[PDB]
Design an enzyme around this catalytic site. Structure first.
Site, PDB file in Angstrom:
ATOM      1  N   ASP A 196       5.739  -1.820  -9.602  1.00  0.00           N
ATOM      2  CA  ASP A 196       6.154  -1.926  -8.206  1.00  0.00           C
ATOM      3  C   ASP A 196       6.266  -3.359  -7.670  1.00  0.00           C
ATOM      4  O   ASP A 196       7.327  -3.758  -7.175  1.00  0.00           O
ATOM      5  CB  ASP A 196       5.190  -1.110  -7.331  1.00  0.00           C
ATOM      6  CG  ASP A 196       3.716  -1.457  -7.576  1.00  0.00           C
ATOM      7  OD1 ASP A 196       2.897  -0.774  -6.968  1.00  0.00           O
ATOM      8  OD2 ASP A 196       3.374  -2.376  -8.382  1.00  0.00           O
ATOM      9  N   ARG A 231      -6.051 -10.633  -3.483  1.00  0.00           N
ATOM     10  CA  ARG A 231      -7.094 -10.401  -2.489  1.00  0.00           C
ATOM     11  C   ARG A 231      -7.819 -11.693  -2.104  1.00  0.00           C
ATOM     12  O   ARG A 231      -7.802 -12.095  -0.937  1.00  0.00           O
ATOM     13  CB  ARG A 231      -8.092  -9.354  -2.993  1.00  0.00           C
ATOM     14  CG  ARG A 231      -7.443  -8.041  -3.460  1.00  0.00           C
ATOM     15  CD  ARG A 231      -8.367  -6.852  -3.262  1.00  0.00           C
ATOM     16  NE  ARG A 231      -7.998  -5.748  -4.121  1.00  0.00           N
ATOM     17  CZ  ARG A 231      -8.542  -4.540  -4.066  1.00  0.00           C
ATOM     18  NH1 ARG A 231      -9.450  -4.260  -3.140  1.00  0.00           N
ATOM     19  NH2 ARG A 231      -8.183  -3.611  -4.942  1.00  0.00           N
ATOM     20  N   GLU A 234      -5.833  -8.919  -9.226  1.00  0.00           N
ATOM     21  CA  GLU A 234      -6.603  -8.515  -8.058  1.00  0.00           C
ATOM     22  C   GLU A 234      -7.268  -9.723  -7.400  1.00  0.00           C
ATOM     23  O   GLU A 234      -7.280  -9.841  -6.165  1.00  0.00           O
ATOM     24  CB  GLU A 234      -7.632  -7.453  -8.451  1.00  0.00           C
ATOM     25  CG  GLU A 234      -7.037  -6.139  -8.953  1.00  0.00           C
ATOM     26  CD  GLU A 234      -6.580  -5.212  -7.838  1.00  0.00           C
ATOM     27  OE1 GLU A 234      -6.175  -4.077  -8.164  1.00  0.00           O
ATOM     28  OE2 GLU A 234      -6.644  -5.580  -6.643  1.00  0.00           O
ATOM     29  N   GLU A 243       0.573   1.538   2.156  1.00  0.00           N
ATOM     30  CA  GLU A 243       1.999   1.303   1.881  1.00  0.00           C
ATOM     31  C   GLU A 243       2.919   1.964   2.913  1.00  0.00           C
ATOM     32  O   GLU A 243       3.967   1.406   3.257  1.00  0.00           O
ATOM     33  CB  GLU A 243       2.366   1.780   0.477  1.00  0.00           C
ATOM     34  CG  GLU A 243       1.881   0.872  -0.672  1.00  0.00           C
ATOM     35  CD  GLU A 243       0.427   1.120  -1.041  1.00  0.00           C
ATOM     36  OE1 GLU A 243      -0.138   0.318  -1.827  1.00  0.00           O
ATOM     37  OE2 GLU A 243      -0.149   2.096  -0.537  1.00  0.00           O
TER      38      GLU A 243
HETATM   39  C1  LIG Z   1      -3.127   0.771 -10.022  1.00  0.00           C
HETATM   40  O1  LIG Z   1      -2.234   0.369  -8.997  1.00  0.00           O
HETATM   41  C2  LIG Z   1      -2.577  -0.876  -8.475  1.00  0.00           C
HETATM   42  O2  LIG Z   1      -2.571  -1.871  -9.539  1.00  0.00           O
HETATM   43  C3  LIG Z   1      -1.247  -1.978 -10.140  1.00  0.00           C
HETATM   44  C4  LIG Z   1      -1.323  -3.083 -11.172  1.00  0.00           C
HETATM   45  O3  LIG Z   1      -2.238  -2.695 -12.182  1.00  0.00           O
HETATM   46  C5  LIG Z   1      -0.168  -2.314  -9.124  1.00  0.00           C
HETATM   47  O4  LIG Z   1       1.115  -2.138  -9.809  1.00  0.00           O
HETATM   48  C6  LIG Z   1      -0.196  -1.436  -7.916  1.00  0.00           C
HETATM   49  O5  LIG Z   1       0.625  -1.965  -6.812  1.00  0.00           O
HETATM   50  C7  LIG Z   1      -1.561  -1.202  -7.396  1.00  0.00           C
HETATM   51  S1  LIG Z   1      -2.178  -2.767  -6.557  1.00  0.00           S
HETATM   52  C8  LIG Z   1      -2.003  -2.559  -4.757  1.00  0.00           C
HETATM   53  O6  LIG Z   1      -3.036  -1.587  -4.350  1.00  0.00           O
HETATM   54  C9  LIG Z   1      -3.683  -1.634  -3.041  1.00  0.00           C
HETATM   55  C10 LIG Z   1      -2.889  -0.841  -2.016  1.00  0.00           C
HETATM   56  O7  LIG Z   1      -2.732   0.535  -2.455  1.00  0.00           O
HETATM   57  C11 LIG Z   1      -3.896  -3.099  -2.666  1.00  0.00           C
HETATM   58  O8  LIG Z   1      -4.847  -3.682  -3.570  1.00  0.00           O
HETATM   59  C12 LIG Z   1      -2.662  -3.912  -2.748  1.00  0.00           C
HETATM   60  O9  LIG Z   1      -1.710  -3.381  -1.764  1.00  0.00           O
HETATM   61  C13 LIG Z   1      -2.085  -3.947  -4.113  1.00  0.00           C
HETATM   62  O10 LIG Z   1      -0.740  -4.461  -4.046  1.00  0.00           O
HETATM   63 CA   LIG Z   2       0.601  -4.058  -1.909  1.00  0.00          CA
END
Ligand SMILES: CO[C@H]1O[C@H](CO)[C@@H](O)[C@H](O)[C@@H]1S[C@H]1O[C@H](CO)[C@@H](O)[C@H](O)[C@@H]1O
Ligand SMILES: [Ca+2]
Length: 455
Positions: A219, A90, A86, A355
């Site tokens: 993902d 970010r 994160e 997304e």
């Molecule tokens: C729990 O899901 C989040 O965390 C896991 C990793 O622990 C990732 O596999 C998953 O993509 C998301 S992070 C995703 O979330 C936000 C958008 O919905 C944003 O922080 C960002 O796009 C990030 O990729």
């Molecule tokens: Ca993302």
């Protein structure tokens, strides 16, 4: 010239930002219903995540104000545990993008300071990084019950660390993250390119074998294979090979069709049992597929992109509020009286996630089909109708199925301004020279980073 829909995005941005300025300035997240804030990093998360969005939308007086905060108030020495993934997508990503768009070396200086504080996470027997690192004490550790890390988390930090090395000339960032990629390239336990969710930091091997999802925890591994390949000037053939392999794996093992509308969707596999469960997170995939096609991937990827874009659109519009829930289920067989998109009561939240509009942006950029703009405008109108807080801000909601009582959760996630409104602004743009797909690759949090245009 800005058009009508871009002006609408700007109006939404400025209503969100007036809440952040009044009630959460310099804090991680606005709590708009209670007119307060929350912290987890304590690093002005929403501000950093929105720097490049402000620049792109032309909000220059706001950008100037935020830059002054970064200059005087952003400090990384606190005793605080942060998630490496994160943090990277970010804050490190948002600072790098702010640097590139503004030319202001302040943002790179802060990025380099921050990146150096994340490096203890890689000090593991396998060099697969721990999940958490304390930026003030230098101590890194896994979660409390396991020495596993999350596969998406260790494979979705590469763009940022690679770029940081390129800009600073300090190789340690690139070397650490590329070791991870190369190691995973050689691991056993994939299913036709599909990766398990977890990886042990002591042994370096996948765990939770036989369980495959394209949603949370896996993902963005797939997303970052393609994006690293693009970033590197399309010279790292292993990344492309692993991506092409993975997409065939998706086709072979995870794709099914819904009832009654026969929509193509991506499900989950556990010890050979298929499950028609799809995180909204999986809606990254149509956009990533289309991005690949722009860069020369096979036409079959575009057919799949268009099908999945329709499905993700329906995940939104089949809800009473027009906003997708966190998780949907599809029926493989006809169910009297049921829509395609089913939602368990527990899963009905919407956190303003990006997304769908992310993938609409790519699908429009690559196809030119204006229906994708219309779909994004529809979703934005739904955000305005059901999540707007009058005093300022927009809030996650607990019930996408109740237009009269959507039930705000009192939180504006940083990715609403970092991602959702950024992609919407770009989706509506009349200008393909604006953050061209030939020149930038967006990271996992919509922070554009330059393509290394090759030798
Ligand atoms: C729990 O899901 C989040 O965390 C896991 C990793 O622990 C990732 O596999 C998953 O993509 C998301 S992070 C995703 O979330 C936000 C958008 O919905 C944003 O922080 C960002 O796009 C990030 O990729
Ligand atoms: Ca993302």
């Amino acid at each position: 010239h800005l058009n009508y829909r871009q002006k609408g995005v700007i109006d939404v941005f400025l209503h969100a930002w007036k809440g952040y300025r009044k009630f959460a300035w310099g804090h991680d997240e606005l709590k708009p219903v209670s007119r307060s804030f929350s912290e987890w990093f304590g690093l002005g998360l929403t501000l950093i995540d929105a720097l490049d969005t402000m620049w792109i939308l032309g909000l220059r007086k706001e950008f100037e104000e935020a830059r002054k905060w970064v200059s005087k108030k952003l400090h990384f020495e606190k005793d605080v545990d942060v998630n490496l993934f994160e943090s990277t997508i970010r804050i490190l990503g948002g600072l790098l993008s702010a640097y590139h768009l503004s030319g202001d070396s302040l943002f790179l200086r802060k990025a380099e300071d921050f990146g150096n504080r994340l490096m203890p996470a890689f000090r593991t027997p396998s060099k697969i990084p721990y999940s958490d690192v304390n930026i003030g004490t230098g101590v890194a550790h896994p979660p409390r019950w396991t020495s596993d890390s999350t596969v998406a988390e260790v494979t979705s930090i590469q763009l940022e660390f690679r770029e940081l090395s390129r800009l600073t000339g300090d190789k340690k960032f690139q070397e650490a993250v590329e070791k991870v990629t190369q190691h995973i390239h050689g691991l056993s336990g994939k299913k036709d390119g599909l990766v398990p969710m977890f990886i042990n930091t002591h042994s370096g091997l996948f765990t939770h074998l036989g369980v495959f999802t394209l949603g949370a925890r896996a993902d963005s591994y797939y997303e970052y294979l393609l994006k690293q390949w693009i970033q590197g000037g399309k010279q790292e053939t292993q990344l492309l090979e692993d991506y092409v392999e993975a997409i065939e794996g998706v086709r072979t093992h995870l794709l099914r069709h819904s009832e009654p509308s026969k929509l193509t969707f991506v499900g989950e596999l556990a010890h050979g049992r298929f499950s028609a469960k799809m995180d909204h997170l999986v809606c990254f995939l149509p956009g990533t597929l289309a991005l690949g096609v722009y860069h020369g991937l096979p036409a079959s990827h575009m057919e799949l992109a268009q099908e999945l874009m329709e499905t993700c659109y329906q995940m939104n519009r089949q809800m009473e509020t027009g906003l997708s829930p966190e998780i949907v289920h599809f029926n493989l067989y006809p169910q009297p009286g049921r829509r395609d998109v089913e939602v368990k009561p527990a899963d009905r939240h919407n956190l303003l996630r990006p997304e769908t509009v992310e993938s609409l942006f790519y699908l429009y950029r690559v196809t030119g089909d204006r229906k994708y703009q219309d779909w994004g405008w529809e979703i934005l109108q739904s955000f305005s109708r059901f999540t707007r807080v009058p005093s300022g801000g927009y809030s996650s909601i607990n019930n996408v199925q109740d237009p009269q009582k959507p039930e705000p959760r009192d939180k504006m996630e940083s990715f609403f301004l970092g991602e959702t409104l950024k992609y919407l602004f770009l989706l509506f743009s009349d200008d393909p020279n604006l953050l061209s797909l030939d020149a930038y690759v967006f990271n996992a949090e919509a922070h554009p980073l330059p393509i290394w245009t090759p030798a």
